[PDB]
Every structure is written in structure tokens, then in C-alpha cells.
Amino acid sequence: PVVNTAYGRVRGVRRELNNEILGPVVQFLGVPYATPPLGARRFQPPEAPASWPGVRNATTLPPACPQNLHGALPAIMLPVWFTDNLEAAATYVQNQSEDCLYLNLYVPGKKPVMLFLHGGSYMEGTGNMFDGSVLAAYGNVIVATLNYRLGVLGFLSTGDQAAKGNYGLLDQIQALRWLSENIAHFGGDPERITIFGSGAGASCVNLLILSHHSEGLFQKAIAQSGTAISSWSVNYQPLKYTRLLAAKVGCDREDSAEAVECLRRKPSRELVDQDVQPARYHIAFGPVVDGDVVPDDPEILMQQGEFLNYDMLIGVNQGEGLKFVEVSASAFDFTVSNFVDNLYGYPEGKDVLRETIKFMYTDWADRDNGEMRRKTLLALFTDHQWVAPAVATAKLHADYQSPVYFYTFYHHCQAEGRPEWADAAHGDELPYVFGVPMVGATDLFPCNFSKNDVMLSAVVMTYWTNFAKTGDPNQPVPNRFEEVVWSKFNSKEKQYLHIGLKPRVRDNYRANKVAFWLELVPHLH
Amino acid sequence: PVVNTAYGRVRGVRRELNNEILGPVVQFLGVPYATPPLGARRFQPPEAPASWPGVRNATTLPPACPQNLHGALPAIMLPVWFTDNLEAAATYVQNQSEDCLYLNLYVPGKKPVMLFLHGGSYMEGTGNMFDGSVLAAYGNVIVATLNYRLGVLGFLSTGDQAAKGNYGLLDQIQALRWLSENIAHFGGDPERITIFGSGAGASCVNLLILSHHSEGLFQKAIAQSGTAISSWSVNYQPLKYTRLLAAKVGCDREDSAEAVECLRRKPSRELVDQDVQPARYHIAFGPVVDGDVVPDDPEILMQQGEFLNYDMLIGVNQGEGLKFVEVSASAFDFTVSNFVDNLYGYPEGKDVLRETIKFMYTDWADRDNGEMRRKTLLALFTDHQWVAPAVATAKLHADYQSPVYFYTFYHHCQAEGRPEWADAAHGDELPYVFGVPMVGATDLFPCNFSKNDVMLSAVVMTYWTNFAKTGDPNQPVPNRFEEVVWSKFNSKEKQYLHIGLKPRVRDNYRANKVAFWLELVPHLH
């Protein structure tokens, strides 16, 4: 397994898969895409790599650039299986170094590419823990789980010229180019790149469409559970926090542009161990508006239809926010005051909105019971963050002559604390799209797989692969049900599809709550 | 059929009923109860009558004191069958005269009395058109349909001393005394008087409980479709209007007390032909707060529990207000602005309430169709007037150790413009309690009676008669269903009973809308 690219010649490996169904998976763990930053051009955009003679021995898990899984990280943005089994995930990124600009591959003539921008809160994660070879061989596609500058030294900007456009986004654009101008040797199609991701890694899958440098690189998108217009998708206070890690290591010279030229020699391990604690439901180090890759906010920029006709696929796990409440008449009256204070932009005229919300999410038919409160509160954080910025992105993107789809996941692998009372909960969609049941349970996903779960993987890896093939999720190839047609989303009818437990194509998901959060509350302020 | 009372000796008559079921009905049309006002003591309280020797020939329809059925009367307060077939009703009160202080009776030892205070808008009506002999003989009770000072010279007050406590209420209290101290000769029980009425004649059935002069007279009540705390139950601007009929006949001397002493000689026929047009949904001549019979408003007076333990029975015809709309996105946006302006007490801070109402009474699942609007508007006038001042009277009267019942009528005799799209509509409960089907259709009620309707009369004249017997509607004696127990109303559960088309004892009528109108909107102002 040896191939050659314009940059040189690289080797590979091949493995035998666990399940009896699947066959010849080839792997190319660790191939590069750009020159690694070293300390001179840190806090700086990337450049192409060098060239080598002979053969490059590249088959290992490459180092993942520095993170810290014991850092009092936010517990809302991160998924469940990442939080609970943290001891298993922590034993997976052990070797870390400033040099992380590599990318894995999985080769099963012009096959589609499925670049996976791993999720998280922009603080940790890696493609090493999302080793999808089952997904690589089932649908007969090429996966690529890269690594990019994430964390402190990942997405810099300050307001001055010393920290220009966010180096992470254009960092993974450097890889979008590499995959676009070197993939013919690997058997891929440079005209069918389909970025996809989850969590807050899908927030930066919309952000790439509205920019400019993305023109000739990719053609489609997939947005699992994220959106560019939520309350933790973009950073809006770079300067206040960028001068607060410098207040514990020391660069806060009152001269504005006197922080890069002392930190740029600071070692990477001390610079990623600061308690930059963001405001509630806000982030600290994410993509920022500067002008070259984020000209104008997606609030405005999305209205003027300068984005081309790609085909976004939005989705929402039904029930997620299980870490918002985990029952009285003054306990349910206590979350719904600090919640409103924390996440409303802080205008004046609040005293009406709290009571309107408190009236709308009550069930007056049976008020008394304690399973209304602590169960509608889980329906008040699922709606304001994941459920109704999504339809706003669906409408305005469907109007401008473009196809936008939808879905709503429901069914999870049953484990501890996961009854039907406990639905997806920001996760439990990832194992199924990754094929964890179909080859036996792995380490980080402990559950009790059955033959009921394994049928879901077939359909959810046929959709997400036929998609990359042609955008419609069904045309090439066809559980408990079958053949249901994948219905679109248009402003008039708003048909979601319910890829849950029995795939019925229902309509108009939560009309009352979506309309309350989207078309009534803007008037109150 | 000749009897004697403490005032003298009176004759009677007896008739044979149309239906084969019923038998010996006796009647005493026209017996007096008080001295008729003549022109000296007009605008003045009543007094006892004289005494006569021999026998008084009293069997005719007595004159009904002056009204005017062609006077551009309000079309919301009045029932339907009274408005449509106005030509039939107008041929029924032909002979009118200042002298109207008489009362009918119907004798079928200490039998209960069922004094009926006829409805309307306090401008017209009479007991002559509600001749209930079927109701008199079926349940074996005594009816009494009196006449009282109604209209212009009926409920006077000005703010000065020239017009003291409302002469109509204490006028029908004079009859409440007469029936309480002369009924032993007629076979009635002076300790079981049960006032009942409908329309805005049931508004002045609550008003008598909260007063004082009602102590030893009656013991129960029935409130069909009315309440003392609605927007047309009491007059709150006597002076502005009492000086406006005097501006077309002439008494508006700028001296305050210079209107009684010129009008008191004016003939009754000119004084009842003035266009005193009230404000929308308000009235002009109704009971007013002065101090002796209405000490304090039922807004306050009902809170302090000075009213004794009677047993009110509230009720609401499901669907009524069919003369509120009789479909666009700016037609439904046009009623819900002037409606809010007209009927809100005119404070500042309106611009939020209109939009909140417009959001709550929409059906976002299917917005487009034209049978949402012009059908939820009929559900916006039924709720703010008849449906949710009623439950407020039920709760606060059930708390103070008293029994309060409830019901919700649904089924009507089918006629023109009366499908199941068109429910009760402020009326169609009166024929059934009056027995119009059971003896064949009368003049003023044209319909097509069937054997389906005639079973409803049995139950609705067993309830309203067992009630007067013992207050519980069921204990002595027991369609499409049977034996369903008459459930009470208490603050915790709010069980209505649905005496409609199939008597199922459901619970918590319109919790969302009742709670919206009763426990959310008071904060917005």
C-alpha cells in the first residue's frame, strides 16, 4: 500500500474489520497537509509543506495538539458520553505537541470525500477517537479526520492588526485546498467535498459557506445539532478575555499591540492551562468577525443572499439539555429567572417576559404534579438553543432557491439512566452514524447492543452517503419501516422527517413553541 | 278556583294542557303585589297595596309597563330568537301602561316557589312571553313571572339625593316579601324561594345575595349565562347619561337636583323614547352602587365574605357571541384592535396585549385556512364575557364553605343557520327548560321538534326542580345517557358537567384560555 502525491511518496497500511459483513479497509494515518507552526510563525496563517525523496513511513496515530481534559470545562456544550466516561477519553490523546497539522484518511476513481470537522466546544477533541472505517467501507466512501489549531492558540483575534483572521478556519481551509489539489492520486473527486460535523464543530460548517475562500473547494454541507446563529457560535468579546490569560502569565502591557511579541515564545503547554471561564452559554475562543473570512455577521450576511446554492442538512436530537436540570413551585420559579437574566442580551423590560414564559411552558390541565416541572425545563433549553435557531436557518436558506432538509432523531442505545424518559440528550447520534453497534461495542461507547440497533445504522449510513454522492439522500439506493421518501423543507409547510424509531414523515415540528420563540418574543423587546 | 289572602279575595282559572302526559294546571294571571306608582311617587320606592271586599276578577295577561321594541336596541345582549323573530315578539306586549306592578302564578302544602326574573338588557321583556305551565305541572312546582320597573324609569340614581337606591331591585324585593308573607294561602313555602333567571336578568340574581334586605326572603339562586362582575352588569356613569335624555325633552338645569321635579310629571310614553345609546358592551340603566342595596361593588364586597351560604349554580352555553362576527389576514387583525381598545378600561401599555392575544388565538399548525379566523373570533368574545368571569365567581364562592355547581350546554333544536357549526349562541337553552318541545312548537319558537329533543326536557326539568326542592339536583328522583352524578365545583379540580348532547362528567373546562384571561393578563397592566 504505497502511493505518491505531488509532495512526494507515502506508504500506508490495511486492516481486517471485526464484523463478517465488511472487507478490505485501507488506512493512511498521519499524512500531512501544511507546514507546522514552530514558534516563529505562531499566531500566523499557514503555508504549504516541503517535499521529500523516497518513502514516508506514515501509519500511527499522530499527536494531537495540546488540550487539557481536566480543566473545569463547560458541561453543556460537550456531549454526554464524552463527559461521563471522561476517564476513557482522557487515555486517548496522551501524546500532544504544537505540531498537529496532519490528517487521517481511509481509502476503501473519483470517490466522494467526507471531511469530518470534529465537535466539542473548540477546546478539545480529535479525529483519533472517531476512527470511522466501518463508515468508510459500508457506503464505499473516503473519510478524513484532520486536526487543526484548537484551544487557546487556535482562533486568535484581538481588535488590532497583531491578530488577524481566525487561523483555525483558514487552517482547515488549507486542508480543504490540499484535498482539492492532491486527491486525484488517492482516487477522490476534488469536486465532491462534503464537509460534515457535529456539536459546535458543525457551527463552523455554516461559517465556511458564507465566506469567500471556500469557492472552488467543496460543494455541500451537513449540520448536526449546530448553527452559526446561536448563543455560543461566535465570539463577540475577544479583547476582554485575550487580556486575562495575559494577566496570569504576564503580557498585559497597556500598549495595545504588546501581547503577541511575548507570548509567541511562551511554550504551548503553559499557554493552554489558563482558566478562561466564559460567560454562561457563551464561549471564549471561537471564530470572530474580522473581514476576510467573516466579513459580516451571519445575522446580516445571511440575509443578503451572497452565499451560493449549496444544500445544507439541519438536524436536532429530540431531547437534549439533560444537563440543564440534574420540582417545587419556587424551584421551577428559580431557573426561569436566572435563565432569562443570563441569556437575553440584558435589555430593560424583562418583568413581562419571565411571566409569559412561565405561563407558556406550564400544563394547566394538571399543574400540581412534580413531573411537569423538571420535565418542561428540559423542554425550555432544548428549544431556545437547538430547536429554534434551526428553523430560522432552514426558511431563509430555502427561500433563495436552495434545497434544505431536516430530521429529528429519537432512539438511543439503552444504558444506565437512559429510559424513554431520557431521549438522545446531546449525543447518541454519533455511535449510529459511526457504526459502533455493527462491529461490536468499543471502549468509549459502553452499552448493550442488540439486533434492533443494528438496523438503524444501515439507513443512517445510506442517507449520509447517498447524500455525499448526489445530495438527495435516496436516489441511488434504497428499521421497522422502509422506503419512506426523504421530504424537503420549504417555507410554506415545514415538513420534518423523524428518523427516529419508526420513520414516519410528519409535519411542522412544534409549531407553537417555534412560533413563540421566533415570531412573538422579538416584539416584547 | 277562588282563594283568599290577607289582602282580600281573588279568583282564578284552570286550563287543559296540550300534551297527553300532563294534567290539571291552574293559573292566576295578574294578581298584585304592591301599590302602583302613579306620578306623585314616581322615581320613588314602593309600598304595600290596599285591601278590597268581595272577589277580584284577575285572569288576563296584565299590561306590561312601557317598552319599545323598535328602538335600535343592542344586538349583543339580547338572545337570538328574540332578535330574529322580532315581529312575533312585538305582537305580544301591545298594551302598556305605567301600572305594571303585578305578577302571574301557576298552582299545580308548602311547595317551592320559582320566581323568574326575566332577562333582556334591562330595556324590554316580560313574563307574559315565558308562560311556563308545562314547567309548572311536570316537576310539580309553582312559577311566578312578575313585572318590575324596567327601562328608563326603572333603576334610577344620579349621584345626588334626588334619586336614591335602585328602585327596580327593591321593587322586586317588595314582591319577594309579598311571596314570603302571603303564600301560605296559595300552598307555597315562604322558606324555599329560589330566584332564577337568564341573560342579564341573572346578573341581578347575584346582586340580591350580596345585599342585606334579602335576608329572610329567599334561600337559593340560579345564574344562567350571567354574572355580577361582567362588563355590562352594573352602571358606572349614571350622571353623564341621566343628563342626556333631559337634553332632548328638557330638564338639564345646571342646578344638580333640578331634573326629577320636571320629569316626574312627564308622561311615561315620551320618557321611554330617547336614544340613550350606551358605550360598546356597556349599559345605560342598570343597578348602581349607592349604599343601601349595593353598599360596595361586587368586585370588593364579594371578597370580604359577608354573603351567607346560599348555593349558586353558574352555567355557560358553549358557543355564544355569534353576533360578534356576522377571514383575511387584515380582517382578523381589525376586530382584535378595536375590540381591545373598546373593552379594556383604556390604560397605557396596549401594544403588547393585542399581539399576545393575536398569537394565543391562532392555530399555527394550519394558519392559512379561512375557517380559523371568523371561528376563533367567535371563541374570543365567548371567553372574555361569559366563560371567564364565571369561574372567578365559582372559585371564590366555593372557598367560603358554600356549594357552587356548573354545567355547559351544547345541543340545540336544528333550524335555519343552526348546524353543529352554530352552537347554542346566547339562547336555545330557554325552550328546553320551558318545555316548548313537549307540548308542540309555539309561535315565537319556530323549529322542527323531534323525539330526540323531548328527552332533554325531562332531565333539564328534573335538575332545575329537584334543585329548588333540596339544592342538590339529583337526590329525590333520577338523553342517550342516564344516572351521571351531578359533580360539584371546588378550587382544586374544577369539574364541569356537560349537560349537552351526551352527559359525560368531564373536567377543567378550557384550562388554557381560562388561565390566560384570569391569571396572566392582570400582570400586563
Residue numbers in the entry:
A (entry chain B), B (entry chain A): 42 to 149, 175 to 392, 401 to 552, 563 to 609
Q: Could you share sentences copied from the article?
A:
Neuroligins are postsynaptic membrane cell adhesion molecules that connect presynaptic and postsynaptic neurons, mediate the transmission of signals between synapses, and shape the characteristics of neural networks through specific synaptic functions. NLGNs belong to single transmembrane proteins, and they all consist of a large extracellular, acetylcholinesterase-like domain (CLD) and a carbohydrate-binding region, following the transmembrane region of O-glycosylation helix and the C-terminal intracellular region as postsynaptic density zone (PDZ) recognition component, which mainly binds to postsynaptic target proteins such as Gephyrin and postsynaptic density protein, thus promoting synaptic differentiation and strengthening the stability of synaptic space and the function of transmitting intersynaptic signals. The ectodomains of NLGNs can form specific cross-synaptic connections with neurexins (NRXNs) of the presynaptic membrane, and these connections can be regulated by the membrane-associated mucin (MAM) domain-containing glycosylphosphatidylinositol anchor (MDGAs). The NLGN structures were highly conserved in both human NLGN2 and human NLGN3 dimer forms as two symmetrical elliptical spheres, and the interface comprises a four-helix bundle including two helices from each protomer.
NLGN1 is mainly expressed at excitatory synapses, NLGN2 is mainly expressed at inhibitory synapses, NLGN3 is expressed at both excitatory and inhibitory synapses, and NL4 expression seems to be limited to the glycinergic synapses of retinal glial cells and several other regions of the central nervous system. For NLGN2 protomer, it contains an α/β hydrolase fold, a 13-stranded central curved β-sheet surrounded by 22 α-helices. The interface area between NLGN2 dimer is about 744 Å2, which consisted of interacting residues (E429, H607, M434, F433, A599, Q592, L604, A439, W438, and Q596), among which E429 and H607 form salt bridges, and other residues mainly contribute hydrophobic interactions. The extracellular domain of NLGN2 is a cholinesterase-like domain, which might be required for synapse-specific functions. The overall structure of NLGN2 and NLGN3 protomers is very similar, with root-mean-square deviation (RMSD) of 1.518 Å over 522 Cα atoms. However, when chain A from NLGN2 and NLGN3 was superimposed, the orientation of chain B from NLGN3 has a rotation relative to that from NLGN2, indicating the distinct arrangement adopted by different NLGNs. The structural alignment shows that the relative rotation of chain B may affect the interaction between NLGN2 and MDGA1. The interacting residues were mapped to the previously identified patches A–C. The results intuitively showed a slight difference in patch B, where F408 of NLGN2 was substituted by Y431 in NLGN3. Sequence alignment shows that NLGN2 also has the corresponding arginine residue at position 428 in a conserved region.
